[PDB]
Amino acid sequence: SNGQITAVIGAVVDVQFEDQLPPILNALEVQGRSPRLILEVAQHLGENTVRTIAMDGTEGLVRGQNVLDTGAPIKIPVGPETLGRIMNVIGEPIDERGPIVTDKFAAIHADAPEFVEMSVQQEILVTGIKVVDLLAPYAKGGKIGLFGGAGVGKTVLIMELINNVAKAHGGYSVFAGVGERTREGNDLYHEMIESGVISLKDKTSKVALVYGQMNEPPGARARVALTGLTVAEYFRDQEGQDVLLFIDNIFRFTQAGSEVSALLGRIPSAVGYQPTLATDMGTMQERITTTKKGSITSVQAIYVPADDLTDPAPATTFAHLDATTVLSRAIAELGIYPAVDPLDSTSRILDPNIIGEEHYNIARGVQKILQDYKSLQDIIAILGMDELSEEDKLIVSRARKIQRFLSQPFQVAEVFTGHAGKLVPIKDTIKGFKMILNGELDHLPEVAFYMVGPIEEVVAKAEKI
Amino acid sequence: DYHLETERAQRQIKQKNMVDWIVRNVMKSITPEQERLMLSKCISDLKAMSIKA
Amino acid sequence: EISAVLEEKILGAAPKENLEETGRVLSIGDGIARVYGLKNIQAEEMVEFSSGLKGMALNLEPDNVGIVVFGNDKHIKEGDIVKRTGAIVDVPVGEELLGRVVDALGNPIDGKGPIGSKTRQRVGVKAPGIIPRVSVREPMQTGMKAVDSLVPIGRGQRELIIGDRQTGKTAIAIDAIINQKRFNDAQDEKKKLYCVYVAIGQKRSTVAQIVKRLTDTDAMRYTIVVSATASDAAPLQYLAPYSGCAMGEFFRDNGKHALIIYDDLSKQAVAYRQMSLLLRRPPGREAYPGDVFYLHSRLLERAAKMSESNGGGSLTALPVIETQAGDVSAYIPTNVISITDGQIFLETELFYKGIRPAINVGLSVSRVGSAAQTRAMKQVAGSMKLELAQYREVAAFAQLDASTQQLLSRGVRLTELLKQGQYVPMAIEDQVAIIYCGVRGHLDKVEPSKITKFEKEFSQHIKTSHRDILDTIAKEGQISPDTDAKLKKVVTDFLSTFQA
Amino acid sequence: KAVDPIQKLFLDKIKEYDQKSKAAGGKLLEASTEIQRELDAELDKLKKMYGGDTADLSKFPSFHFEDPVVDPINM
């Protein structure tokens, strides 16, 4: 039927319907509004009034304004025709190339795959990054989370993974920009234009982009991730393809959910969060999976507010991921890029029966050396290096060489620095770290280990000095 | 600068006492016949607003 | 004289008491007024009280309307009459505000008279999207040698000025405003820039001194000062950044270029925290509301570089954040760092040692970088950045080799070269020449205490009988190796002439 | 035109004050004591600040070139 706006507070619009109530998650179109204001029903308030979250701004809304029930949730175009196109939260094209002419639509809200639709295959995905491919290796089909604060480098790691994996992938790709800079989305779009992954002149585009950024109202930022999920779910189930899903970033989705939680009349959770943060994140993340119909490899960035890991939103996101890559500000202060914490990143593929016995033993030896160095740093900061024994000096020297060799010049970061980006095969990674752990390179200065890809570049840089 | 400050101070003082004398004389300007005329004009304006429905 | 002004003010003060759907104040307190009535009022609509104050209709409850008062609450009593204006909260915009000090609502407080504005713009306007945006490619010249070399700013960029109290944040911002006089007085309309200074929570004497400093340097002719001082109400301090952003968005949407400074956004967040705590909203991190990130993000997203189809305009933001004990790990600084494109960190330790501006090179970065610089400045700043990185690498442990002592001396000379006095910004050609002399080893025989005197005398010498060098630099746009050799020869001649 | 009686009365009082000020030669008309005291205090403060007590500032001041003694050229 037809409803009327009875309250507007923030991005929360209460609308009263006369005859029949639209269901929860149903999309309502506001009449008399030019740029398609769409409201999603969140709860039935009672007395034939429902409460909705707006997918755009609520300015210019008067009380009693007519709103029309569409009889369905937010439906978004899915298919081969969405490749190479940019879409907003409600699936409208925003790349100014005309409408997306497709026959297939899907609702952005869907139930998670069941317990019987699960695959347990764990095959290592080689990324070309030494700290990733050694300590927390990625899996072909599975969830990867890049945790990081403000300015520690997550977009650079996202772009490096897209450069190293998505171009030489073959299957498909979906990017979901969630609450980030619109400049980043413009730069990524033009990057995919130049690299040939998007073709403006013809077909055979491989990546579909969905963008809802930080200038959007909190209603739009809380649903654009589901739109990108819907594109990836169609490419996985109805086509049986291997899909790459990049999301940047998840915390904007779970923060936009908390911005409207006070306006929904909810009691706030601990540290002023939404009391349904865990359940909303669970229902969102369980749709991203590798099924028996198709495979999805997902890379999601996660923001930690005020450089805190015990915040409820990243602490909830930790249990929903296979591989974690935690980025630390203190490592970035030391000039090591990427600033991956080696003692805080886990993969669950790091098993001697999956990635090899030598690879597992080298990774655990590196982690033990860095833990011993971290324990020694307290005595080093006070009494200096003179009080240390000879084995402690060897531990410190090898650990500093290991920390320098974990850094790697990225191809996407060259404009920041000028170093040529290096792609390191995993056999060269385990050979170089086995050489460092065996003490075969103790006679080299540690500066030669800095910003070089293979161990041959370490020897060449040491001989250059 | 001294001439400018002196003229500005005299202008400010002239404005202040003119405003105060205008307030006092306006409070002394009310006559009952003009009060009845103003009340009739207010009633006519209220009736004109009543017409504009 | 005076009587004509009195007649004009009387004739312009038409009450026009007709229709006027109104409401009654049920209760007044804590800066929030509950109004019974106003059935057809809109959300975020400006209203007027009976005492002349103005407010914004925040909450559209069924039986009442919650209104945020832009002023003191002692002028409003129970049962007052609230009139709706029919417009969402808007401020006057235009070129009429240039040279004016206004409050958060746009009312002039400098005593210069009314503003003859023709257009008004709302303060809650959404930011441009992906398509109407283009990459930042035009340079923003603040006139500071360290900023223009190491942490460059482009037009449309959002660059944060973050540091402790009394470290020179306002000094950098005012020098950036003053430096645009050479562009504004020139003929190139594309390089002209219009400045907006938003003073939030400061003392009134400080704002008066800033306005006098801008008037003495004649930077006031292209500057709008939006003032919300420490004695003003918290809603005025909250509204002032958005009013100034609307005034800068006027130039942004009309093909012009505007630079806006919010000094400081930490005091605006304190005022908004007071407003939310008086609204009984749930406190979060450090008792702040959970939408303070959205507050700064919706303010700063309106500063962007438009496309050529949108007029080619731009709005540049310089937010200011005051930290406690140099902590950039707090909530508000981390929010503004995540929003903006880069920061300029100011150190208390460097400020106590006389290094002014006290810019931390290791912490202040700019994500735009090479697109925000000219060719000659970028060519010399890459070498300067590499040499300062080498100096910071070798001075961390040396607390020796001839090469290490050479790098230490070079880094000391570059550090003394980047020091600049207050209120005297430099043109980009003078900075390019100065950094060229520092980088190329021309200061190797010069003591670090005489670098400033050498810099002044070399600038005088270049402006005296080396105008053809500046003409060649402006024509080429860079430094060719032939002109590099000529510059090395005339530098050697100048240093031999000064002392022999 | 629908001229308000209050605005017309205000204009009549302003014209009356202007005519009386012309009759009074532009002097202050029926000013209160406190305004006169504040005017005298401000005039005295500006006279002391601008040095009007030393000499009359409404006229052209006279100047004397302080006779210079150069440094000893000889030793």
Ligand SMILES: Nc1ncnc2c1ncn2[C@@H]1O[C@H](COP(=O)(O)OP(=O)(O)OP(=O)(O)O)[C@@H](O)[C@H]1O
């Ligand atoms: N691999 C790298 N090589 C060189 N510099 C790097 C690298 N990674 C990050 N940086 C530096 O860190 C800065 C921050 O990068 P980026 O914008 O990707 O961080 P982020 O974690 O996404 O930040 P935000 O959360 O604010 O979006 C870069 O602009 C660059 O200066």
Ligand SMILES: Nc1ncnc2c1ncn2[C@@H]1O[C@H](COP(=O)(O)OP(=O)(O)OP(=O)(O)O)[C@@H](O)[C@H]1O
């Ligand atoms: N480059 C400079 N050269 C000389 N003095 C400087 C320079 N920069 C700043 N100062 C001085 O440092 C003092 C503090 O600077 P300023 O007031 O700009 O800092 P601020 O961070 O805005 O302080 P506040 O926290 O009080 O706002 C002033 O006395 C100013 O003159």
Ligand SMILES: [Mg+2]
């Ligand atoms: Mg990022």
Ligand SMILES: [Mg+2]
């Ligand atoms: Mg200041």
